[PDB]
Design a binder for this molecule. Sequence first.
Ligand SMILES: *Cc1c(COP(=O)(O)O)cnc(C)c1O
Lengths: 49, 491, 419, 139
Amino acid sequence: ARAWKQMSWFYYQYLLVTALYMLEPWERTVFNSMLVSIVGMALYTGYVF
Amino acid sequence: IHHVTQNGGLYKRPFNEAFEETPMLVAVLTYVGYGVLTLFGYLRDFLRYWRCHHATEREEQKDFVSLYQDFENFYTRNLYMRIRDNWNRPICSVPGARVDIMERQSHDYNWSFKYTGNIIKGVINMGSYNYLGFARNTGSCQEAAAKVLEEYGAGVCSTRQEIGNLDKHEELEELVARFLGVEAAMAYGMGFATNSMNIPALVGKGCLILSDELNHASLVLGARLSGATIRIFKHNNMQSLEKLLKDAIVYGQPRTRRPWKKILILVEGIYSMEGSIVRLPEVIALKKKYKAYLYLDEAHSIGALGPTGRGVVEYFGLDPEDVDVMMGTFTKSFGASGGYIGGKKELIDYLRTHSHSAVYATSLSPPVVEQIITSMKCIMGSLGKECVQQLAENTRYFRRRLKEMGFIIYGNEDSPVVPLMLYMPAKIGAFGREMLKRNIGVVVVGFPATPIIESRARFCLSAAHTKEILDTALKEIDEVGDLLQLKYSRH
Amino acid sequence: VKEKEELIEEWQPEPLVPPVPKDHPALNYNIVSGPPSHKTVVNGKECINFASFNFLGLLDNPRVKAAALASLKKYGVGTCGPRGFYGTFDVHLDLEDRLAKFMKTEEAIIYSYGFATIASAIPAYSKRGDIVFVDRAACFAIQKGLQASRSDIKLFKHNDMADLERLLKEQEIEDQKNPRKARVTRRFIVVEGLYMNTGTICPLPELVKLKYKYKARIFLEESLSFGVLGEHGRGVTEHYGINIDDIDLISANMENALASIGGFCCGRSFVIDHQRLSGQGYCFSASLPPLLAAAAIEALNIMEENPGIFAVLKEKCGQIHKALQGISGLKVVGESLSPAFHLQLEESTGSREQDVRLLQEIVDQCMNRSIALTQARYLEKEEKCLPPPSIRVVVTVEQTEEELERAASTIKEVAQAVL
Amino acid sequence: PNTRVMNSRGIWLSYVLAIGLLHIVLLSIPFVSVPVVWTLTNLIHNMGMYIFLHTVKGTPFETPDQGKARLLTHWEQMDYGVQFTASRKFLTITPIVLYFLTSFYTKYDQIHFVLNTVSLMSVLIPKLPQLHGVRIFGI
Ligand SMILES: *Cc1c(COP(=O)(O)O)cnc(C)c1O
């Protein structure tokens, strides 16, 4: 049960490093999308090779 | 005798300062933290090409050449404005050990604030210049000014070379001269206004000023106002000091090669950021080797160094008669307002004539003179001279305590200011909120007032802090430094 | 060669302080025991004072001294720290609100020092490219921010229209000379509402309408003009009845006619916010001690509860300025409105150093007649436009005219004796 | 304060990995070819190093020198103007290495010569020390 709570700490740890913390969540998801879709394109091209 | 190493700098005690270089992996992550933040600023200001609400330059009958640079206000609205909730919090009590803080918040994302009603009480502070603990509305020390307040009033409406010159002013100027152990002394209105109005009355056009990298906004400004060549040497680098000092004499001006008219040195005792003490006997030994003068700044150092604390000169045990001019303040150990200049009687009399401030600015308020006097009486001999032995105990305890807890601390170990290193800019914005949740208010120091990879937080120790007050704070930090992983040191 | 540098080391600089006395100027710091009240005592000589700047006389009000003592027993004495780093009090917030309310303006900053409130305000705006137009007889506090801000000062003659317009047209020549560079000039105009050194008043409507004709910016520095000029005493803007929002910055200090310490700058919130970030004496010095602040709020309460005090000072100016003119050897070079006279001598001698010493004798004899005056000192080798020696006459509202006219009589007598 | 910003610690190491991220981002694109990945990343890099060095002038913060470098772009104001320093030469060597790997990749083609040279040209031309303050008809 606490593993879902321990996991959000590491996400909170990801908020501090690379300065996601005070980043106005209107803008955070914009960076989250640019975080996902580049890694989402890293998989689809990586499975080719 | 401890060190007489190369320059003749005779040391009595061990020195033991610590400037731990920042780790490789830590430093790279900082630039990413700024790099994402400088990225959205161009994004945000691009969104402002149509219309968090702004100050809105008057349209009514204006729109001349615009007032501000848009780009010079970049960091103040994209890194500062995000996290400006801290270092601005109003307090509503006596800034002693526990401080009542008015609570405020912003639903407009720190663009406009609002007091709710709340008074967060019993908050341990570590960000006030209250070393010897004279910030209290109790005891007989502050009570003496109440007699002075009901008698005199709250300020001369005049100038020192004009009408306004009270007996208290003449008394205090004597009193510091015996305290410093120098010939004569003279008080000024505020400590900032001292250096910005007296240093231009000393040096002139053909002078050369050798100031440190990080003095203050005072000492730079006085060096700008006197038209004089300013040259910067590295922080506590006597080798870099002497290298400039060598070439300053064997050359002259850049344009002509005439000799310099006179030269002098601007150094401080305890540098506020990265709380460290200047290698002073290596300076006294070097200025005698090159006939330079010396301006010294005991703004933090007095009341904090030496037994029955009398600045860094007693802390090195040296004589006051080799420092050509001594300056310190009364806001940062005494709980008062203003500053002095100590020096030779020939020097003081020249500055009682050419002052910029005894001839234009109004002088001190009468009751705060009394708060200075009674505080020096409790030092010279009633919460007296036992607290400086308490603070040095509190300094030396707290300085080893965070070092063994895996934190990273700068400066000399005996320095009461505790610079605690953050590195990430988000770790600035979290830490002030985080400690405030844990009933403690501290001071975090931002980017432009530091270098890039410094971004530190700062603790002001106090003799008013007891052991239980101090150890409770040690408990709270142990969680937060764990919570933010700011355990950067290897030791 | 290595040893040759050692040969240069045998060299002496100048000694630090110069050989101070010209003939013997020691200037004799005049010891005042006790409060410098209306009934004061200087060097053991009881007298009434005429350079103390409590025009409202609020130094001797026990309403004030009761208010500040309450602040003293609950806050302390001094702020241990600057204004950011936990050094901002409620009374600091209350006083900033009150000055905006008293001036009907948006914001008001507070500096901890009456001198560095305009030496630290001007370089926050003009920065090495901008042109500042200075009336050549503003006080020394203005004359240092202009030196700090490395911007080209263009002086113009004192209180004197259309010589300023001579300068403006010369920039209209330069405006059409490089229009890209004239897009980034952002020039300014600095004027003091009532000059400390001349005691005159400047024509603002002849300057406000002049502003839009040449697209400049006006910095008012009403230090003396603050307090008693208007019907409620808001300065020349209440006196001229012109709009507050015409002026880009209004500076003052809480020392003349408020009997407190420090300065403030009130104005529209597009600019007053900006000094919180780059005030250079705002965010680097100790904040204002709170017992001075709560004293100054009550001083605002007294000024707002009783606006009739500003009426009796104006006519009291209108009598000592009237009933002193016509005396030989000197001249009244302050206007009728100004409560700070300048009483410099006509038929000047040669060396000013002697001329001060001649002026010194009148002030010494007058203090023997239990009437205390000043000599209005300056810094000669720095001031960049220095006035001739006057002596200042400062009137309060607690003057009780029957003894005020005694002073005009006893100076009518002793002046011709020295002359 | 923009004079010790490239004279800091590990800024050189972090400058590489930004480009190293930018390539691996550009390497994982579907409808692209392994020559024009290198063609793209030498164009974008030399675009950034022009706009972030030779175009924007002043400081993002406020300078207590009363805006002395208000008319000076970021390259001109490094290390208070002394040119042949330890860090300007690192900033000149690095696009040349980015020119030679993009010379190695794309197999020395003619259009990949033309497009990848004038980016490398227009970045070193302002870095001539005798082109300190001369600005071509603007900025
Ligand atoms: C405190 C500080 C000042 C400012 O003077 P205060 O009136 O005490 O605020 C000037 N110089 C230094 C080094 C300071 O630490």
